[PDB]
Design a protein around this ligand. Structure first.
Ligand code: HEC
Ligand SMILES: [Cu+2]
Lengths: 99, 250
């Protein structure tokens, strides 16, 4: 599934922000508008036993050019809450469910 | 951020005179602005805004870790005044503005400029290159004293645009009673169980990571009593200046 970082009107949001995927399916986050952006998974809001360092960017890492992508495949089932560290207060947050 | 005010507030100054960043940026901290006493028509001048704060302060970042603060500001100029173009900006002034990108609050509002978030260690004082208008080429601009308003913020805000609180604010108890259990979570954060003996009701208040608790198990808490410390070290402030668009004669 492809998720845009920043809407086509410059809105600070993941498009889509809430979606479901099968285990092993890849999620391609691509820089679209309002960058720099990054994708960080909430360590306290993912399925138990999952290492957030294996599926997220570092809070200090950033995608600062249009078209830059970060790909990740989730296998454990459950809900995963993620966010953009610099725009988390903007409401640039999302949640993916692996079913 | 300056984009949250631009996205849902058509004008940044409210009828009370308060700038809309104070709706989410709740701590008050001083902001300063130095502007030349008078300027001539069609001349570039600099509006320097100061957003000072102790630089050894570390705020709670959106993931619980502590880090440095970022600065942002909104400059409200009179109609006719706008950001000076690049060909009119001197080289002694281009190194002063670093490499900041001043954006218009909205494409129709060319007299309201916003900048940030930018790192506070580098931009505690920002220089806005403004071009003074010309009354001979603008019939609504006159040689008069004009008000200039500025809003300066440093640190993460407390409320998001949907009304949700961030982890950079105080977490209050949603019910009075006695704390029967405090579950310290694996990756940080807490789960506090309050037994409201007066209403025979059990409520669980969840606290995010990056915040330390001020309560112990078996302690009696009142409704809205602060259960954690206030982790906000930033704040928003506003100031105003008066500029005289001067006639080149007398
Ligand atoms: C509520 C809708 C807000 C309005 C209006 C404004 N800001 Fe804001 N800002 C808000 C939040 C919740 C956050 C935190 C985002 C996060 O998760 O980190 C912010 C953050 C900033 C920052 C960056 C702080 C830092 O990283 O240290 C700055 C520089 C900032 N905000 C400035 C600012 C200004 C000047 C505004 C008025 C135009 C403004 N914000 C409005 C919430 C809200
Ligand atoms: Cu982002």
């Amino acid at each position: 599934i492809d998720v845009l970082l920043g809407a086509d009107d410059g809105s600070l949001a993941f498009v889509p922000s809430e979606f479901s995927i099968s285990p092993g399916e890849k999620i391609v986050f691509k820089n679209n508008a309002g960058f720099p952006h990054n994708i960080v998974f909430d360590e306290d809001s993912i399925p138990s036993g999952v290492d957030a360092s294996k599926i997220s960017m570092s809070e200090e890492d950033l995608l600062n050019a249009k078209g830059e992508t970060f790909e990740v495949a989730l296998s454990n089932k459950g809900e995963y809450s993620f966010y953009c560290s610099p725009h988390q207060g903007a409401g640039m947050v999302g949640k993916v469910t692996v079913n | 951020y300056p984009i949250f005010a631009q996205q849902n507030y058509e004008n940044p100054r409210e009828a009370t005179g308060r700038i809309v960043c104070a709706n989410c940026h709740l701590a008050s901290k001083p902001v300063d602005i130095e502007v030349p006493q008078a300027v001539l028509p069609d001349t570039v001048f600099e509006a320097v805004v100061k957003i000072p704060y102790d630089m050894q302060l570390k705020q709670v970042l959106a993931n619980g870790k502590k880090g440095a603060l970022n600065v942002g500001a909104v400059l409200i100029l009179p109609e006719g005044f706008e950001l000076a173009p690049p060909d009119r900006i001197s080289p002694e002034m281009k190194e002063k503005i670093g490499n900041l990108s001043f954006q218009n609050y909205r494409p129709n509002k060319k007299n309201i400029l916003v900048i940030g978030p930018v790192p506070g260690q580098k931009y505690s004082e920002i220089t806005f290159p403004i071009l003074a208008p010309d009354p001979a080429t603008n019939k609504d601009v006159h040689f008069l004293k004009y008000p200039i308003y500025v809003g300066g913020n440093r640190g993460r805000g407390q409320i998001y645009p949907d009304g949700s609180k961030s982890n950079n604010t105080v977490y209050n108890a949603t019910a009075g009673g006695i704390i029967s259990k405090i579950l310290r979570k694996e990756k940080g954060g807490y789960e506090i169980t309050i037994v409201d003996a007066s209403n025979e009701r059990q409520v669980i208040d969840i606290i995010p990571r990056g915040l330390e608790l001020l309560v112990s198990e078996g302690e009696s808490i009142k409704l809205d009593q602060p259960l954690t410390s206030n982790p906000n070290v930033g704040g928003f402030g506003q100031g105003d200046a008066e500029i005289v668009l001067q006639d080149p004669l007398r």
